[PDB]
Symmetry: C3
Subunit: 56 residues, 3 copies
């Protein structure tokens, strides 16, 4: 099957809808700059490194 | 270019189709709750943290 | 809100277009086998593990 990536502006908006995200979808929250994957009965944060700036 | 995220229920199901998944696609296997990225001649596991529960 | 995954052959190619990738998209660079997520004013590398070979 196929899933994809969903994003919300804030972790707050994301939590309001996370029950409705299917397992296997990635979830990004823009304010906090955090990435997770939805799993059975929860979600697991993806380890990210420091921000690399955009090229000049 | 654009890729996406593919999803399978189990390890065996994913291993059976992985040759046909192009590089740069993410792969989620629900049973193991593991996420990978397809790379040249194989795939690399994405490091995940412990499960965060869904809000009550 | 949904995003997705974009890929490029090389890091140089990706850097050429990364301003036009929206926040919350994942970015894969094939030659370097690196995975990032686009964030405010930059991009963050995703921690990957060693390559698992494709099944026999």
């Amino acid at each position: 099957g196929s899933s994809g990536v969903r994003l919300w502006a804030t972790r707050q908006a994301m939590l309001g809808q996370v029950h409705e995200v299917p397992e296997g979808w990635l979830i990004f929250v823009a304010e906090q700059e955090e990435l997770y994957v939805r799993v059975q009965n929860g979600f697991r944060k993806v380890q990210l490194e420091a921000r690399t700036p955009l090229p000049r």
